[PDB]
Design a protein around this ligand. Sequence first.
Ligand SMILES: COc1ccccc1[C@@H]1C[C@@H]1NC(=O)c1ccc2nc[nH]c2c1
Ligand SMILES: [Zn+2]
Length: 318
Amino acid sequence: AWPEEKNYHQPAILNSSALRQIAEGTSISEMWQNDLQPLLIERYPGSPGSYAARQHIMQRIQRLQADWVLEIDTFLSQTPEGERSFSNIISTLNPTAKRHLVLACHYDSKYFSHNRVFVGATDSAVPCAMMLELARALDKKLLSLKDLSLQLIFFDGEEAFLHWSPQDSLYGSRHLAAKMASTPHPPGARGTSQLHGMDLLVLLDLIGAPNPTFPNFFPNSARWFERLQAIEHELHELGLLKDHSLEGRYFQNYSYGGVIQDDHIPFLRRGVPVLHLIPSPFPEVWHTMDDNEENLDESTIDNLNKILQVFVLEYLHL
Ligand SMILES: COc1ccccc1[C@@H]1C[C@@H]1NC(=O)c1ccc2nc[nH]c2c1
Ligand SMILES: [Zn+2]
């Protein structure tokens, strides 16, 4: 019965005073310096930056007061370049809780030929930094969770090595979804997997460009997409967003009709509800050397941080 609870789960709406406190409690400059900039490095699988990005993500989470439990899902797989090692990073509050809201991005960067190096600013260093800043900004509230909690997933190997294909893409997410699908949850249960425990997978990807438009991809998360719309509307109305227009909304309610392959596919195809926070169109700088810090829109990322943090608190009734 409990795997159906996600279908009836309600948010706890925060009032205006709470929303101001949340908007006050996140610091885009702190995130820029302390979470984003160390990740703006070459970090394709097995590179020195891959280990350094992984170590940076784990250290930023480990310094928080909330009782995050870190797991590294490391595995080998053949690739166009030969066998490679991949390591997904899983950061979980309340591991034995039956249900988790899951936030996720990919922390690898795409490999490009060797003056300029590809650091994937939007793709997806900024999503990584947004998740760490959410963990930091909500630490005291999350501390109060010490059958629903929060989990972060940083996928390795999202990018193709050579040619985007089912076999040359989503190495980490395809591995982790298979692993979770095969793993009892709660331990000792019959039937139910760790995937039954995923209330909702919120996948952040290609965030950081100015004027993003996120469409409503999936009917079975459309009501959660509408909460993002309503949070954006209310924060705007309260004057808590920067350089933001109602005529330039981030979250529009129409769909895409196509299929945007991404780390969520291995979870979606196994029944996990997905809120895919990827823009359409992709950023103009997408998969070019211009996907760098200079072309990021700080105020837009700040606004999305505020929207996402309100969303997560409301989801968790915190
Ligand atoms: C330079 O781009 C290419 C040229 C030739 C062959 C393959 C590619 C690259 C794989 C990408 N395709 C994508 O659909 C894609 C989908 C979701 C993503 N989330 C972050 N990044 C993404 C990229
Ligand atoms: Zn990419």
